[PDB]
Amino acid sequence: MTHHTEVFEGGTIDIEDDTSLTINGKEISYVHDAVKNKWSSRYLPYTQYDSLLDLARAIIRDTVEFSGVKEGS
């Protein structure tokens, strides 16, 4: 238990121990816009997102890197 699995358009979302943002096993380091730190997520720089769950899905949707089979066109 205590883990959330989710498949977004081919990308697996790994949430472990009710923490840890991972996609396809790759560590997703969030950067919050909070008082502690004024910066954007390292994987999505200067892009505006709404929530944390939204963020995770936005990454997979915006980057084909987490989609899998696509090196280019």
Side-chain angles (χ1 to χ4, degrees), residues 25-73:
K26 291 182 58 56
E27 303 169 283
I28 303 299
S29 308
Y30 2 65
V31 185
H32 292 205
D33 201 78
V35 181
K36 283 78 178 186
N37 193 216
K38 229 303 183 186
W39 193 250
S40 313
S41 303
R42 188 168 181 122
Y43 291 90
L44 290 181
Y46 302 101
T47 48
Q48 300 182 211
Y49 10 82
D50 184 273
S51 296
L52 203 290
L53 190 281
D54 172 68
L55 172 60
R57 293 175 172 180
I59 301 176
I60 304 174
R61 171 182 172 149
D62 192 77
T63 55
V64 294
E65 289 63 35
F66 295 98
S67 308
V69 185
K70 179 171 293 196
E71 55 188 275
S73 304

Side-chain angles (χ1 to χ4, degrees), residues 16-33:
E16 200 53 88
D17 190 35
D18 219 279
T19 338
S20 185
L21 212 303
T22 9
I23 301 177
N24 183 264
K26 291 182 58 56
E27 303 169 283
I28 303 299
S29 308
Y30 2 65
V31 185
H32 292 205
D33 201 78

